[PDB]
């Protein structure tokens, strides 16, 4: 059983009011069953796109979640992961 | 020099529930997906059939369709043999393909992991357990090695089909495999884990292919505190990388981030903090 690592990053330089894409890349987990949520101001974002799950040369799994967003000054974004390796969900905030 | 890999992920939760899903990569570009829910293998590029005719592709696909059903049945039966020695959940991963060396050369591989650990490979003409694999696998592997039809098919796939197919992919997918996409960079800062410091971040996004150079600079002097992160995928088949630098309060002035990439034609991006 291996714990997921989570990285959150934008596709383009963030400019308030300009459309962008926020990425949540989740790696190093096992087994492959997992739940990934992207959050805006603590609320689940509905239309989040998921890549096909895959795995590395070391056999650990990875997957990319992403969503269209338009950042503002005061919106906070995060990615929250539930997996059997962790009793509690793991959240990482976008650094902005 | 390209690694072609077919990645199979099979999960068995109990005697009733299982699924198998595969993805296929040529280098870092995905060429196929085959979901458990789909009868047929899906192309994720216009060129994913390579140079094979529809007849040849269909023969290949039919062979894989038979394999997927057979593998599932076999695993749930070959459980009961050494079970409840072992039992559910069971996770199996298979990585098979070939690496296309300079000129005419290629080497093929077929590796299998059980519960996230490498245990079995196909080698030459037979299945073998790797040293340190659980001893209970020896009997299932003997049973598999008695199936000469399977052995001959796997030998064909590794020795003949893999390099054949990949030559055709490389020709058919030339413009995508050789695509050049430009990085765009930006600077930000975040909290440091060290007191008295801030972490400067140089973000580089949208570049293809992977190889890239990113360094914090003070004039011509490379800043050896530069900490390069991992290559992270964007959803549009480009890459993201950030390089960080922990710097003392009021040491920020004069710092720049410099980015070199094949797509820029010798014309580096330089951003000043
Ligand atoms: C990437 C592998 C490609 C193999 C596909 C071609 C062979 C195939 O599909 N074989 C099937 C059925 O074969 C029959 O029909 C065949 C033709 O139609 C022949 O006529 C052949 O002579 C019959 O026997 C066969 O059932 C194979 O056994 C399918 C599974 C082979 C995959 C071997 C995977 C190795 C798994 C090791 C897992 C180790 C961990 C583990 C083991 C056991 C339990 C739990 C975990
Ligand atoms: C597929 O290629 C392998 C090459 O590794 C062949 O296996 C070798 O076969 C020779 C005889 O031709 C044996 O002496 C070697 O010991 C085998 N090599 C290994 C590493 O075991 C295999 O015969 C080929 N199969 C087909 C159908 O072409
Ligand atoms: C042993 C595989 C190597 C040879 C493959 C050459 C033909 C390309 C096949 C592409 C479709 C991928 C099928 C995935 C099936 C699976 O692994 O479960
Ligand atoms: C089998 O596994 C599935 C998925 O984990 C689960 O929904 C179901 O409860 C299990 N069934 C039995 C009979 O154990
Ligand atoms: C996977 O596909 C098989 C064969 O079509 C099917 O019987 C099975 O229910 C699928 N598994 C899941 C979890 O949907």
Numbering used by the authors:
A (entry chain B): 2 to 97
B (entry chain A): 7 to 279
Article excerpt on this structure:
Whereas conventional T-cells are activated by peptide antigens presented by MHC proteins, iNKT-cells typically recognize glycolipid antigens presented by MHC class 1 like CD1d molecules on antigen presenting cells. The larger A’-pocket binds the fatty acid part while the linear F’-pocket accommodates the phytosphingosine chain.
To gain insights into the poor antigenic potency of the glycolipids but high affinity TCR binding, we determined the crystal structure of the CD1d/5d-complex as well as that of the complex of CD1d with compound 23, which resembles 5d but lacks the amide group. As expected, 23 gives rise to well-defined electron density and is rigidly presented using the conserved H-bond network involving CD1d-residues Asp80 and the 3’- and 4’-OH of phytosphingosine, as well as CD1d Thr156 and the glycosidic oxygen, and most importantly, CD1d-residue Asp153 and the 2”-, and 3”-OH of the galactose. Especially the 2”-OH interaction with CD1d Asp153 is increased compared to 23 (3.0 vs. 2.6 Å), while the 3’-OH of phytosphingosine is also less intimately contacted by CD1d Asp80 (3.1 vs. 2.5 Å). When looking down into the binding groove of CD1d (TCR view), we noticed lack of the F’-roof closure by 5d, while 23 induced the F’-roof formation. We next compared the precise presentation of both ligand headgroups by CD1d. As suggested by the changes in hydrogen bond distances, the galactose of 5d is slightly elevated compared to 23, correlating with the increased distance in H-bonding interactions with CD1d. Since the only difference between both glycolipids is the presence (5d) or absence of the amide group, this indicates that the amide is indeed responsible for the slight elevation of the galactose but more importantly for the failure in closure of the F’ roof in the binary complex, the latter of which is likely the main reason for the low antigenicity of the α-galactosylsphingamides.
